[PDB]
Chains A and B, each alone.
Chain A
Amino acid sequence: ACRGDGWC
């Protein structure tokens, strides 16, 4: 997934 500042 990895959205925002590298939030998997």
Chain B
Amino acid sequence: FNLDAEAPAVLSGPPGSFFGFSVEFYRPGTDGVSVLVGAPKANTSQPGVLQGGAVYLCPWGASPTQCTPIEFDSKGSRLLESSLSSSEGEEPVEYKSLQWFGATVRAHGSSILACAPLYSWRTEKEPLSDPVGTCYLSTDNFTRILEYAPCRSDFSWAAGQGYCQGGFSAEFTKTGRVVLGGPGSYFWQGQILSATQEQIAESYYPEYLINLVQGQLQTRQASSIYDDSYLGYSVAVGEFSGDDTEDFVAGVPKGNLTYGYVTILNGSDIRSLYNFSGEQMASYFGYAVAATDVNGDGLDDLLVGAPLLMDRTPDGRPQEVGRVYVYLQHPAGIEPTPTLTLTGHDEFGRFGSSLTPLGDLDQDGYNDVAIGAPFGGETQQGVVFVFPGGPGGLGSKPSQVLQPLWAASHTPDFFGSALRGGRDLDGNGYPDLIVGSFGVDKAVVYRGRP
């Protein structure tokens, strides 16, 4: 409720670049804080690459120009090794055009992960169009950059990891371990992959496209009855296993007859610990997930978004409003059924499409939560709701409601489709919120006050 909603700072990217599709805090030291903004439709200087996508670095202290692009990869699409001579024709081996690089953006310390969920290649054998996805990892503050495409393997096509789309979702652990979601592995069963920055580096070898990180953790293929589950559609991290190694929270939005479910995996050996089911068919239970302690007891609590949750009005009319489910963790474990639920009020508003912990916004000893409804509001420009944590979890009513100040253009703003909080960039001792709105290629940052 203390967020300076009346005077937020606005960032602007190139038109039609989906600037603000992904947002993140960056701090390679207490001094030199910056805001990262993904723009997966941005054109780049890469030769022969149409709209490769780009990530922007926006240092605090705007004047004159804040944002500039991080050059992860200056090279265009590489050529097929076994076809440069050939008869006639030089075939590209990979396809970086329309790869949506910067669709996902995450950072930890002086490390930056940026993913291209629609990157695809051919393989050095039979011609395919496998969207394996790829990621670029910047470490030690840009002094070296590594490509990481753990789905680009020997196992091609849909039956394998060909359509994995690794990087569709991603996250860092509090120790800097990389965690990727790929919802397309094994005929869209989905998959979670994870490696430490060290393992990725100690096996890096650009000459051979198919890289194999030694010691990589990854879920395995199941029987065909699990096809079309989209495991790894969303991802989060938190401690749920009673140790000091953070665990992997992963959405499986189309699992169990499309009722969907969320799963929690043991952070050490990626084995299953919990399962939580949706309550309505095709509500996309698992569209977004998050983990944070919302009642000040030390134990991280689970949050799940189902933005297509349909409900009935008092006068007997159905309506798509969306809903968010909150499961509290106890010393004994976690109850299979939600502790509380938050429901949207705007039809088609997609309440719960985005979630983020905010930390303790008001310094009242309880962490708070922001929930986005990208099509809420009287003009469907999008809305972000702030909910306060307390003795008994999240409050029923939101403490604050952030709406865009600009007028509604002829296309949606998607305000609140991408969120990120829990970091005090200005250093006033109060956490700050970064709200994206890629619909009009803008990204907003809100600032807390005492």
The short answer to whether A and B are in direct contact, CB under 8 Å, is yes
Q: Kindly list chain B residues whose C-beta atoms are within 8 Å of the C-beta of A1.
A: 224
Is B5 part of the binding interface, using a Cβ–Cβ cutoff of 8 Å?
Answer: no
* Bound Cα distance from A6 to B158, whole angstroms: 13
CB distance from B105 to the nearest CB of A (A): 32
Is B248 part of the binding interface, using a Cβ–Cβ cutoff of 8 Å?
Answer: no
Q: Count residues of chain B with CB under 8 A from any CB of chain A.
A: 5
Q: Kindly list chain B residues whose C-beta atoms are within 8 Å of the C-beta of A7.
A: 158-159
* Residues 1-8 of A contacting B (Cβ, < 8 Å): 1, 3-4, 7
CB distance from B191 to the nearest CB of A (A): 16
Q: Kindly list chain A residues whose C-beta atoms are within 8 Å of the C-beta of B159.
A: 3, 7
* Bound Cα distance from A7 to B160, whole angstroms: 13
* Residues 213-257 of B contacting A (Cβ, < 8 Å): 224, 227
* Bound Cα distance from A1 to B221, whole angstroms: 15
Q: Kindly list chain A residues whose C-beta atoms are within 8 Å of the C-beta of B158.
A: 3-4, 7
Q: Kindly list chain B residues whose C-beta atoms are within 8 Å of the C-beta of A4.
A: 158, 187, 227
* Residues 137-186 of B contacting A (Cβ, < 8 Å): 158-159
Q: Kindly list chain A residues whose C-beta atoms are within 8 Å of the C-beta of B227.
A: 3-4
Q: Kindly list chain A residues whose C-beta atoms are within 8 Å of the C-beta of B224.
A: 1, 3
* Bound Cα distance from A4 to B227, whole angstroms: 8
* Bound Cα distance from A7 to B227, whole angstroms: 13
* Bound Cα distance from A1 to B187, whole angstroms: 13
CB distance from A5 to the nearest CB of B (A): 10
* Bound Cα distance from A5 to B158, whole angstroms: 11
CB distance from B174 to the nearest CB of A (A): 38
Q: Kindly list chain A residues whose C-beta atoms are within 8 Å of the C-beta of B187.
A: 3-4
CB distance from A6 to the nearest CB of B (A): 12
Q: Kindly list chain B residues whose C-beta atoms are within 8 Å of the C-beta of A3.
A: 158-159, 187, 224, 227
* Bound Cα distance from A7 to B158, whole angstroms: 10
CB distance from B1 to the nearest CB of A (A): 50
In this complex, what residue of A is CB-closest to B159?
A: A3
CB distance from A7 to the nearest CB of B (A): 8
* Bound Cα distance from A1 to B227, whole angstroms: 12
* Bound Cα distance from A4 to B159, whole angstroms: 9
CB distance from B306 to the nearest CB of A (A): 27
* Bound Cα distance from A4 to B188, whole angstroms: 9
In this complex, what residue of B is CB-closest to A1?
A: B224
CB distance from A4 to the nearest CB of B (A): 6
In this complex, what residue of A is CB-closest to B187?
A: A3
Contact string against A for B residues 328-351, beta-carbon threshold 8 Å, 1 for contact and 0 otherwise: 000000000000000000000000
Residue of A1, A3, A7 with most chain B CB atoms under a 10 A cut-off: A3
CB distance from B223 to the nearest CB of A (A): 10
The contact sample of 10 A-B pairs, CB cut-off 8 A, is A1-B224, A3-B158, A3-B159, A3-B187, A3-B224, A4-B158, A4-B187, A4-B227, A7-B158, A7-B159
Known: A4-B158, A7-B159. 6 other contacts (CB 8 A): A1-B224, A3-B158, A3-B187, A3-B224, A3-B227, A4-B187
6 tightest A-B CB contacts, nearest first: A3-B187, A3-B224, A4-B187, A3-B227, A4-B158, A1-B224
